[PDB]
Amino acid sequence: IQQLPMMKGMGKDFKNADYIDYLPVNMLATPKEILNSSGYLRSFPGITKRYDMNGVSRGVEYNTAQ
Amino acid sequence: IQQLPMMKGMGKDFKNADYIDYLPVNMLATPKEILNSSGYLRSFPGITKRYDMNGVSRGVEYNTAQNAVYRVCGGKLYKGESEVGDVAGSGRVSMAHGRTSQAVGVNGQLVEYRYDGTVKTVSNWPADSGFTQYELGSVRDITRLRGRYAWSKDGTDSWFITDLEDESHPDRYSAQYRAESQPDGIIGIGTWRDFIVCFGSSTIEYFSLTGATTAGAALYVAQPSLMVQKGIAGTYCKTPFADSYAFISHPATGAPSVYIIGSGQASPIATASIEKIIRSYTAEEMATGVMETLRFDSHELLIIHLPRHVLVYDASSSQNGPQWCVLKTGLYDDVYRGVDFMYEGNQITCGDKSEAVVGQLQFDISSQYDKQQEHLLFTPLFKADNARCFDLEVESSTGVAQYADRLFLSATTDGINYGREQMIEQNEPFVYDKRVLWKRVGRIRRLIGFKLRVITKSPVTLSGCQIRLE
Amino acid sequence: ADRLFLSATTDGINYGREQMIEQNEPFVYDKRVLWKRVGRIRRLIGFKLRVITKSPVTLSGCQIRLE
Amino acid sequence: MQIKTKGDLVRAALRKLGVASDATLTDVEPQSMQDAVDDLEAMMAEWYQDGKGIITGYVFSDDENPPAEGDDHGLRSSAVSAVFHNLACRIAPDYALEATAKIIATAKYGKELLYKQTAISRAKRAPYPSRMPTGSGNSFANLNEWHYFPGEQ
Amino acid sequence: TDITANVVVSNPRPIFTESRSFKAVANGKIYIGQIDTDPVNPANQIPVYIENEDGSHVQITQPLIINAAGKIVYNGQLVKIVTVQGHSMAIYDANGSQVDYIANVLKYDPDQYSIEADKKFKYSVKLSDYPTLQDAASAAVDGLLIDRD
Amino acid sequence: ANVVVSNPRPIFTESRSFKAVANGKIYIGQIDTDPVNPANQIPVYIENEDGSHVQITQPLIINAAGKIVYNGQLVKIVTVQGHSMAIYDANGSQVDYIANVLKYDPDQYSIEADKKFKYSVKLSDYPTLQDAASAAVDGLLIDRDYNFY
Amino acid sequence: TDITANVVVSNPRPIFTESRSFKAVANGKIYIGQIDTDPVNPANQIPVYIENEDGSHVQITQPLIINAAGKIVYNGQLVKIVTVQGHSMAIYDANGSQVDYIANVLKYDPDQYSIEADKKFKYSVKLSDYPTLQDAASAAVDGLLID
């Protein structure tokens, strides 16, 4: 019985035959000391529409005075 | 033979299927190197009625000049058992004693009482005197450094000071000070080792006094090497803990979370599950969260009175990771009873939040007033396939009970909902040696986790759970 | 009941066939996600775990009986 | 006898194996009970051999009645201690368990006691051969012209 | 007379038995759906909750499983099932036949005049029958009538 | 999440043993009277799932399971007045006698309540306001926050 | 036709049966206590009243006996044993083995709706029911209505 890590996967690219690791797309990594392993992988939270605005976002800043 | 730790139990929630651990309900953790394990779990002490007072607790502070405990405790002020004065206003108040006056600071004005028997209020100097005549505002918090007070104007960068010879007027020449690295209101104020700590919405800044010997020239100068760069969520989310303040982060930063101030930075002390609980409240609800510190025996507790949670952090027992606990009164989910804990004489006097009464902690009884209480313990999930558990034997210490109270245990296969509840007696009124065990637990298909519900009004001690796995 | 796609590489660049296993059920809190046969590996092998859902995805611990 | 039904046999076998009983915290899912009672029916069908093999009071379920667990089994009181022991021995490979040597010895003893009475009852001696004369001492079958034995027929 | 005594002590775990004979249904599926609909079709089903000790209601898959005892069972253990009142019930055999089908379980109520009577009247508590004022006030809906005591 | 899921079908068993009262007879008679003699009984009615009603002979028959059966299918029996029921075994013994299934009489009390109570209706029970006002007399309540359109 | 429907024929007696089997608890005991408590101790038990054929209540000791059929027996078979509020049941078997323990149970008594209706509703005798006004006023209590 062998355990295979999934937090990061190795590989190679066909362009120049170099070893590049494949990052796990769209899911986070959390260490929590799970039943038999140390850490579990959970997907990124999903977006839901809240308001309708004028256009594409261009800036943000959390005003502290108000 | 395997041993199952019960100081903290893992699980999952049915809402979004995430692994969140179950904190032990209403039971503390103490490492003491017990017979075969390292540490035992003991129930929280029970409350017993001591005095009858006007209303629910609203503030407390241990006067050092006079060896007595002051508490408003609802409608009108109390010193120990005596009355000595009347206070106006409903809510929560911030107290800061002095060497001539007490000071309560209700509403938006610094009402200060006097040991002589008179009441005074902080206000501008008379115009006939010919002084600088500041523009005072509403007050939020109060403190005292050296021989003078210090309060913060509501919703503004300014925090004022108090004169020496007369402690009822701001000052003669210099009393206007401001915080002002960043534009943020002063949520709270406090003192720490001759530094006036000004808790902003986004930053924390330290002020140290300097020898002026001049008319109105910068009595206090801000120290910039000790800035923390994090705010506090609410007015009362701060305490004297260890040598730091241990606040709760403001929503201005990334997310609310408990912290502890270091030399010049804040170090978190809250696990992810605790921050999940903190995020459950809205911004307005979080601002009404009280914090305290209580130390009995070798313990050092940090109690957070959230609207629906009474989370408790035990510093001494957190050898390997934080050790959080939650307290509750009723058999069902309910907020804990008893707001303010203070050490008077050789006993601890707890307040109240739903009754007009005050009570003291007692160690040989586990019931608040005269009602039984619930204690829970959770074993973390284990993954063993096709095994059969037989001898689950927890080790209790008995002989201080009034009736042969029983214990409920159950098992989970999916980690969310529990099976049948088996009744085993775990305590006998005057038997000091007995075994608490269950002879058959049966096969486990994929995974299993246990539970140890106990309903008593007598001290409960459990230390070391072992099961014969095959 | 969303499904999971898994596949294997022998050279580490391009993948083989995609096998479909369901990894989630709307209201079942206890189930196994496994494949019973993977077969001989000649020189080297690596895996992949495509998942296409609109529901939370949690995976923790992949083990293979090596012989 | 408290073991009247087939489900009682299955539960006794499970208790003997230690998998589950009345005092256990976790219990077995009903489909496993269905599989176990099907295995019991198959095992009992294999011993009977249709009248030729081991003969014991047993009624096979009809299918017109849906639940085969609930209906009673015509087992006499002596056969119960053998039947569920053998059932528990056979169910062990279904799980990862292996039956204890005591259970194996008890099953052996039980099957031996099941078959001993039938073995005694079936030990019969064949009649005389066809070409076997009856002597002159009978004096009646000899005088009735019936000198030779009839035969096995 | 002695007290209100509105709660009856009865069996807290339902028992499902066969129709043609007298035996508990073993491994028999149960489907619950809306009024006057077929619960077999998944479109007509309604949520079904397990009520644990804590009071948290956890939803599970619609086909409930019965054990050899005739009681609803989840993963080998008995559970308490709570749903919104007014649900059609369809009990199915393990083989796949139909044992019972109930269009609306509220009709199988010993007193059905109560349902019609509750609709066409207003509720008004009288201080006469109740001993104290607080008891009448607690159980008071839509006004009261002040009488003696 | 209000009502526990339970079997509403009536199962009739013995009083001194666990049996199914095979082939028993149930008599539905007049209130607080002996229903065996043909003198004092009340009509009984089948209530199908759709809502039709059919007349039925007095000696109700019990199936082998213990459930009331007419012809070859299970049935639900409804009577208009209050009744007293007496269950007998196949051999003629008495299993149980209930003088009052319900302590009051639905018919006479229904007439009296029609005489002596206010005929006002509420909005909560009726989905739409027009449907409520259609069957409402002498008053209406507007209980829930009805949406305009 | 479609006649009015008022009552349905039903069995008014409950049966307590063994879990994991289809046997009836021979002579076990049923303890009634508060919601999440242990019903065994006297402190957690709540009063239990018999409900006779005529409306009346007789209080009895908490441990309830069960006959062979699985129905609560007392001396002869006892009627509806009505308690108050929501209780927790801990059924025991004959030899003191726990059959089942349940936390929260609540089932309302279906009989005697007449008393509840009398205590619930408003009195208005109206005028259409009575021929004349004087007799209507004679039986009118706390209200009256016209045509």
Residue numbers in the entry:
A (entry chain a): 3 to 68
B (entry chain f): 3 to 472
C (entry chain a): 406 to 472
D (entry chain r): 1 to 153
E (entry chain Y): 2 to 150
F (entry chain T): 6 to 154
G (entry chain O): 2 to 148
Could you pull the original sentences from the published paper?
Tailed double-stranded DNA (dsDNA) bacteriophages and their eukaryotic counterparts, such as herpesviruses, possess a dodecameric portal at a unique vertex of the capsid; this portal serves as a channel for DNA packaging during viral assembly and delivery. The portal interacts with multiple copies of a scaffolding protein (SP) to form a nucleation complex, which initiates the assembly of the major capsid protein (i.e., coat protein) and other minor proteins into a procapsid. The P22 procapsid consists of an icosahedral coat comprising 415 coat protein (gene product [gp] 5) subunits, a dodecameric ring comprising portal protein (gp1) subunits located at a unique capsid vertex, and an internal core comprising approximately 250–300 SP (gp8) subunits and 3 ejection proteins. In this study, we present the structure of the SP gp8 in complex with the dodecameric portal in the P22 procapsid at subnanometer resolution.
In the mature virion, the portal–tail complex is present at a unique vertex inside the DNA-filled capsid. The portal has a canonical 12-fold structure that is formed by 12 copies of the 725-residue portal protein gp1 arranged around a central tunnel. Further local reconstruction of the portal by applying 12-fold symmetry yielded the structure of the portal at a resolution of 3.2 Å, which was identical to those previously reported structures of the portal in the P22 mature virion including a lower resolution helical barrel structure, flexible tunnel loop, N-terminal, and top regions in the wing (residues 1–5, 422–442, and 480–487, respectively). The tail structure, attached to the portal through interactions with 12 copies of the adaptor protein gp4, was also identical to previously reported P22 tail structures. The C-terminal helical barrel domain (residues 601–725) appeared unstructured. Structural comparison of the procapsid and mature virion portals revealed major differences in the following domains: (1) the top region of the wing domain, which interacted with the SP complex (described below); (2) the stem and clip domains, which likely interacted with the terminase complex motor during DNA packaging; and (3) the helical barrel domain, which was absent in the procapsid. Pressure from the packaged DNA induces conformational changes in the capsid and portal proteins, triggering the dissociation of the terminase complex and the attachment of the tail machinery to retain the packaged DNA.
